[PDB]
Amino acid sequence: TKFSDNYDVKEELGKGAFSVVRRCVHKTTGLEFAAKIINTKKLSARDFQKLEREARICRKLQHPNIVRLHDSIQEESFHYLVFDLVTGGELFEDIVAREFYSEADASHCIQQILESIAYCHSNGIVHRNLKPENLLLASKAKGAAVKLADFGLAIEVNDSEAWHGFAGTPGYLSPEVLKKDPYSKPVDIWACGVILYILLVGYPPFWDEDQHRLYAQIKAGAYDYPSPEWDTVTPEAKSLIDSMLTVNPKKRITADQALKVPWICNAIHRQDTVDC
Amino acid sequence: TKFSDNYDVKEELGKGAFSVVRRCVHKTTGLEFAAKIINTKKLSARDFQKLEREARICRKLQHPNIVRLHDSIQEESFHYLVFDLVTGGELFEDIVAREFYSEADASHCIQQILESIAYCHSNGIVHRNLKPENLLLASKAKGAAVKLADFGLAIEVNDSEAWHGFAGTPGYLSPEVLKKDPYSKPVDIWACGVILYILLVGYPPFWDEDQHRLYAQIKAGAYDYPSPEWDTVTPEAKSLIDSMLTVNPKKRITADQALKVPWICNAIHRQDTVDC
């Protein structure tokens, strides 16, 4: 063990409950990492379970758009989790700063998120808690990759849908989850459309200080494209938001499908093969 | 023991019943501390219990905005409590001096208090006796941190609400406590809103030389924003005072939530994740 033996600890990048993230360097190589240090002694059973969940999953996943969990050390009373070093902050604090994005900037950004997602989805991993406070920018540099994080809710599924409990973030929840129907991968895609909408204008498709109504609207599929903002927005951008924001999850588009839309790439289109 | 062996005692910073606070220096290091010296011989059982209460709790808590209890020595007939040295006095005597604060100055100040509070709240610690006579300014220097004190009432709680007796300070008590309902962490948040209001204008939301009426008003939620003072005050400052001064504690905002309000930080906002 002895993280201290292989890791030089630097400054603090932030903190949470029973945890602090600090910058740290590896000794022999000199590589750079964001290291999440947690109080194992002060953990609760459910907190620990989470810990073992995110841990194990992220360990499986390797991708440019996925904050890589590189290591996991246990030193007596503290558990260390070695993460990609990121320095661009959340995509949230970036959206707010610029208020909103062009269409070009949106497609690129989204395309990235679509890929990290399609990937998890190709590894039986659903994230469940997709949102801009969980999307991180490699660095301040422009074009800097967007990297997916906080898998504390992420789950492993097979080829069939089933109820996995109720968890997520208000504004991003899917119909199928609120309806308490059996759900799967498209739940994340639903959050995508939401974030897209946000990216395009800087405000949500659904909102309301009443959760009931909020939820009624979500399950209804109740959003639109208010003028004037949405006036100079193309149809190919709206149409896409539709296919993601599809209430029937069975008819909702997949990440892989969505990564084949010309508004992402750039008549005839790319059709997925069908085998029975 | 022999505090005298490790501590050079300097001048008197003030005094209370069976106690005097004097400035003192550590010998080998030379560090500076406010040292509360108490007559153990002249203590009553309830006074002692308190002593052991504040003691043990503060010992747990470490924070920039929390007067750190560094040590606790017992010398025959006197018990010493080694505290952070503070020299700015109470935030009370500062408010009175300047009468009241700008909005910027208020948010900063409050944000600090919100953090010390959120912290205790994250360590099962509720303060119960929150007020400006208990908030201390590190030094006379401007920007000097505000540090929380007098935990003589502070209590330890779990995840559930229950009656913890009736204690606090008139003008700051919460509805739930006066209603003698089962109470918890939000009781402090209620005192926050109160202090905020005060910070913004230099007079309380609730007051009355009749306690019954005073209390009737508190439980009622009976305050307002009288003109002209409150005329140049933003809505984001009032609205916030509302969410803290929420009579239904279940619907009252949390410190952590409140530390995510743009009037504190500086459309879209930061949503807390929900797991069941």
Side-chain angles (χ1 to χ4, degrees):
Chain A
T1 73
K2 287 193 185 178
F3 161 105
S4 321
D5 301 8
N6 302 316
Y7 292 105
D8 281 322
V9 206
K10 304 304 164 180
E11 79 276 2
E12 160 177 324
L13 296 190
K15 52 193 174 183
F18 41 81
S19 67
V20 59
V21 184
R22 300 174 61 94
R23 192 178 66 79
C24 75
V25 189
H26 189 256
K27 302 208 175 189
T28 63
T29 76
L31 263 138
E32 251 202 323
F33 300 105
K36 180 171 187 171
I37 318 179
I38 318 180
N39 196 324
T40 297
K41 300 292 183 177
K42 301 190 173 192
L43 272 186
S44 62
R46 187 152 326 183
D47 290 342
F48 201 111
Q49 158 212 353
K50 261 185 150 195
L51 195 57
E52 285 195 9
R53 192 163 214 340
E54 180 165 16
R56 177 183 27 86
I57 298 189
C58 316
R59 169 56 65 171
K60 304 176 166 176
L61 316 157
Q62 284 201 127
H63 192 75
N65 298 106
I66 302 184
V67 178
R68 271 260 49 201
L69 181 62
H70 296 287
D71 206 350
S72 186
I73 307 190
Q74 173 51 52
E75 284 194 11
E76 174 75 13
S77 37
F78 291 118
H79 194 68
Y80 306 58
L81 296 185
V82 179
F83 280 113
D84 281 358
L85 182 73
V86 163
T87 44
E90 293 154 16
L91 161 64
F92 175 84
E93 275 304 325
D94 180 40
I95 292 178
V96 307
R98 307 158 52 181
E99 301 169 286
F100 70 96
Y101 277 41
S102 59
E103 285 197 9
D105 288 332
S107 168
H108 178 66
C109 182
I110 214 66
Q111 177 188 354
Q112 294 190 46
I113 320 177
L114 273 184
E115 299 187 353
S116 77
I117 272 303
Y119 175 69
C120 293
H121 284 216
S122 58
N123 295 277
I125 303 294
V126 165
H127 200 313
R128 312 208 299 163
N129 197 7
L130 189 62
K131 61 183 190 165
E133 300 100 303
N134 282 351
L135 278 146
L136 309 180
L137 304 170
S139 70
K140 275 91 171 178
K142 259 43 184 59
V146 198
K147 308 224 277 197
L148 183 50
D150 187 7
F151 295 66
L153 284 196
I155 58 158
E156 312 164 71
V157 313
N158 42 36
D159 50 282
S160 298
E161 272 186 339
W163 181 240
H164 312 287
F166 187 96
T169 293
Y172 309 83
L173 290 173
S174 40
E176 57 269 33
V177 170
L178 306 156
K179 301 171 153 195
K180 288 172 188 161
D181 296 313
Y183 66 77
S184 191
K185 299 167 174 165
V187 299
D188 289 329
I189 308 298
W190 177 273
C192 264
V194 160
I195 294 169
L196 177 53
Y197 191 96
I198 295 173
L199 294 183
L200 287 180
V201 286
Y203 70 91
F206 315 102
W207 177 88
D208 207 313
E209 290 189 313
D210 196 283
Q211 204 165 244
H212 284 102
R213 272 181 62 84
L214 177 28
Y215 292 173
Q217 306 169 355
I218 308 196
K219 285 174 285 165
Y223 66 106
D224 47 8
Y225 304 133
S227 307
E229 48 267 357
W230 291 90
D231 294 341
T232 37
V233 177
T234 66
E236 302 76 14
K238 296 177 166 168
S239 175
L240 178 54
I241 298 191
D242 306 346
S243 47
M244 286 188 206
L245 299 191
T246 276
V247 185
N248 183 346
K250 295 293 185 179
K251 282 175 161 58
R252 177 174 324 158
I253 186 180
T254 58
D256 294 316
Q257 278 177 336
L259 284 159
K260 299 195 167 189
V261 178
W263 188 84
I264 300 288
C265 321
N266 313 154
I268 60 191
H269 60 309
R270 297 173 165 280
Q271 287 174 59
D272 295 358
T273 305
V274 174
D275 174 23
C276 304
Chain B
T1 73
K2 287 193 185 178
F3 161 105
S4 321
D5 301 8
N6 302 316
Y7 292 105
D8 281 322
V9 206
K10 304 304 164 180
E11 79 276 2
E12 160 177 324
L13 296 190
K15 52 193 174 183
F18 41 81
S19 67
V20 59
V21 184
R22 300 174 61 94
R23 192 178 66 79
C24 75
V25 189
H26 189 256
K27 302 208 175 189
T28 63
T29 76
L31 263 138
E32 251 202 323
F33 300 105
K36 180 171 187 171
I37 318 179
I38 318 180
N39 196 324
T40 297
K41 300 292 183 177
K42 301 190 173 192
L43 272 186
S44 62
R46 187 152 326 183
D47 290 342
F48 201 111
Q49 158 212 353
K50 261 185 150 195
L51 195 57
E52 285 195 9
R53 192 163 214 340
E54 180 165 16
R56 177 183 27 86
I57 298 189
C58 316
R59 169 56 65 171
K60 304 176 166 176
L61 316 157
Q62 284 201 127
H63 192 75
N65 298 106
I66 302 184
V67 178
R68 271 260 49 201
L69 181 62
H70 296 287
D71 206 350
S72 186
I73 307 190
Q74 173 51 52
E75 284 194 11
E76 174 75 13
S77 37
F78 291 118
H79 194 68
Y80 306 58
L81 296 185
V82 179
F83 280 113
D84 281 358
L85 182 73
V86 163
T87 44
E90 293 154 16
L91 161 64
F92 175 84
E93 275 304 325
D94 180 40
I95 292 178
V96 307
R98 307 158 52 181
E99 301 169 286
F100 70 96
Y101 277 41
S102 59
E103 285 197 9
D105 288 332
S107 168
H108 178 66
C109 182
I110 214 66
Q111 177 188 354
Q112 294 190 46
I113 320 177
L114 273 184
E115 299 187 353
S116 77
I117 272 303
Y119 175 69
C120 293
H121 284 216
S122 58
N123 295 277
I125 303 294
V126 165
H127 200 313
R128 312 208 299 163
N129 197 7
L130 189 62
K131 61 183 190 165
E133 300 100 303
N134 282 351
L135 278 146
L136 309 180
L137 304 170
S139 70
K140 275 91 171 178
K142 259 43 184 59
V146 198
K147 308 224 277 197
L148 183 50
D150 187 7
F151 295 66
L153 284 196
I155 58 158
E156 312 164 71
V157 313
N158 42 36
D159 50 282
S160 298
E161 272 186 339
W163 181 240
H164 312 287
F166 187 96
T169 293
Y172 309 83
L173 290 173
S174 40
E176 57 269 33
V177 170
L178 306 156
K179 301 171 153 195
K180 288 172 188 161
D181 296 313
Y183 66 77
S184 191
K185 299 167 174 165
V187 299
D188 289 329
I189 308 298
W190 177 273
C192 264
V194 160
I195 294 169
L196 177 53
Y197 191 96
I198 295 173
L199 294 183
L200 287 180
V201 286
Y203 70 91
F206 315 102
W207 177 88
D208 207 313
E209 290 189 313
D210 196 283
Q211 204 165 244
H212 284 102
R213 272 181 62 84
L214 177 28
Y215 292 173
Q217 306 169 355
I218 308 196
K219 285 174 285 165
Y223 66 106
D224 47 8
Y225 304 133
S227 307
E229 48 267 357
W230 291 90
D231 294 341
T232 37
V233 177
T234 66
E236 302 76 14
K238 296 177 166 168
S239 175
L240 178 54
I241 298 191
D242 306 346
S243 47
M244 286 188 206
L245 299 191
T246 276
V247 185
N248 183 346
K250 295 293 185 179
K251 282 175 161 58
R252 177 174 324 158
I253 186 180
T254 58
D256 294 316
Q257 278 177 336
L259 284 159
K260 299 195 167 189
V261 178
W263 188 84
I264 300 288
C265 321
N266 313 154
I268 60 191
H269 60 309
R270 297 173 165 280
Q271 287 174 59
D272 295 358
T273 305
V274 174
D275 174 23
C276 304

